[PDB]
Structures are given as C-alpha cells and as structure tokens.
Amino acid sequence: GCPAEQRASPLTSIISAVVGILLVVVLGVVFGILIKRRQQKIRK
Amino acid sequence: GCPAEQRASPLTSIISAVVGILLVVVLGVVFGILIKRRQQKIRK
C-alpha cells in the first residue's frame, strides 16, 4: 500500500524548499489582489 | 563541488509538502499575533 523506507538525500531539501517558497509567494499574490478587489469594509 | 544527478522519488513529495505547509502555518501564527499585539493604529 505505502512502500517507502524513508529518505534523507540532499536533493530533497532543494525541492522541499522550492515548494514551500512557491506556495508562500502564490499566497501573498492572491491575498493582496483579494484585499484590493474587496477594498475597505470587509464584513457585509 | 555539487555532486547531484537530480531526484524523482515519492518520499520527496511528502517531505516537500510538509515543509511548505509548515512554513505557511508558522507565518499565519506570527502575523496574527503580530497584528494582535500591535493592535489598532500601526504607524507611529
């Protein structure tokens, strides 16, 4: 079902970091634009 | 100097995801507490 003996390679770091940094940036962009469109008064 | 033949294992995904999700959560906590402590009026 879940054949895996765990890992510990260096390449895993670079890849793991890229993913995290990618999700972060994408979040900031969305949030910014979101708050921009919604403008002031966010509760109606 | 940089001995690496690239990777492509599954374990890399689970690890990469955890890192990204970990950085995100940590960010939210900091931001929330930050804005909370700073309270209204953030420019003095």
* B15: nearest CB among A7, A24, A27: A7
Q: Do B20 and A16 touch (CB under 8 A)?
A: yes
**Chain A residues touching residue B20 (CB < 8 angstroms):** 16, 19-20, 22-24
DSSP state of A10: S
Q: How far is B7 from chain A (nearest CA, A)?
A: 6
**Burial classification of residue A41, based on how many CB atoms lie within 10 Å of its CB (0-12 exposed, 13-18 middle, 19 or more buried):** exposed
Please state how this structure was obtained: NMR
| C-alpha dihedral, B27 to B30 to B31 to B34, nearest 10° | -170
Q: Do A17 and B19 touch (CB under 8 A)?
A: yes
**Cα A20 to the center of its chain, rounded Å:** 5
CATH of domain A1-44: 1.20.5.100
Nearest-angstrom CA–CA distance, A36 and A20: 25
User: Where exactly are the structural domains of chain A?
Assistant: 1-44
